[PDB]
Structure 1
Amino acid sequence: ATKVVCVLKGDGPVQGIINFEQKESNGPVKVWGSIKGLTEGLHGFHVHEFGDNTAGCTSAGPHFNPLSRKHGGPKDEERHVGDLGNVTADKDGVADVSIEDSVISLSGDHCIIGRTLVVHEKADDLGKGGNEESTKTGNAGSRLACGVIGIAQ
């Protein structure tokens, strides 16, 4: 019933299109699309709090964390709402994204509309990095590309 979309762009050559679809306000969100221009391997994938691209991806602020929790992976009870883990780029630098998430929403509350989706330089350690930053950002490094999450037809 609800469909939202995000175009990922940045200061480098990373670009992507990410779709989100939610059948019921109570339901899981299906996340699918493609990102290119990435280094092979894991890249942290998160919804950040602000849909503000004024100065590029830095203006999006921290991970979306309406419930004041620590950073984790998407399968964890202890996570930020915005914690979608990692996408994986192949040797051609392409990530084919296919995620199902029960914590993000497109309606009701915990809504990601108007926020920023960010793909990161490094792997998200999912809060298992063994340092203080692990349970805040997952040590995923800089913001390679981002976009504001908008309502689709």
Structure 2
Amino acid sequence: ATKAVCVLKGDGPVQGTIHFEAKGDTVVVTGSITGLTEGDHGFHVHQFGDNTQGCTSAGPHFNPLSKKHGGPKDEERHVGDLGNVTADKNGVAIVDIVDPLISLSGEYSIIGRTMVVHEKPDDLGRGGNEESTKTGNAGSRLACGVIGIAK
């Protein structure tokens, strides 16, 4: 696809709508999330578009290259690693990202996978431990959605 979309729901106050658009070989991710506690939350494309167990069955991060966990800019990162999104004091987060690694077709295509917002900030793989190299220690999954074709 050239355009896709994601509606984030959970069993909490955290809702959002994430928009995806293919520009050459980057994905412009745009949107907002509401209900967040102030500050950073990890923002990851997890592997499966599977909601049979809420956000739990989305699996780990989309990582077809078997890299370590990392931030959007690091060479060592999962493809699904889109780093942190920041909520203001009103709990709202404008999403604004241009990523050349995730995509909306071919392999690395995120279509039909799961966009997750996390309870905790992502330490971007740079942490005193080994969960850091897996999840960035972004903690729980607050809200998630299957990324579907929009246009």
Give the TM-score band, short-chain normalised.
Answer: over 0.9
Identity of aligned pairs, percent?
82
What secondary structure is seen at the aligned counterpart in 2 of 1:59?
Answer: helix
Q: Which amino acid aligns with 1:78?
A: E
What does 1:1-153 correspond to in 2, within 5 Å?
2-24=2-24, 27-153=25-151
Unaligned 5+ segments in structure 2 are none
Q: Secondary structure at the match of 1:136?
A: helix
Count of aligned pairs: 151
Q: Which contiguous aligned blocks of 4+ residues in structure 1 show a shift greater than 3 angstroms?
A: none
Between the aligned partners of 2:145 and 2:95, the Cα distance in structure 1 is: 16
Shift of 1:118: 0.2
Q: Give structure 1 stretches of 5+ with no counterpart.
A: none
- Determine the C-alpha separation between the residues in 1 that align with 2:18 and 2:90: 19
* Root mean square deviation, CA, Å: 0.9
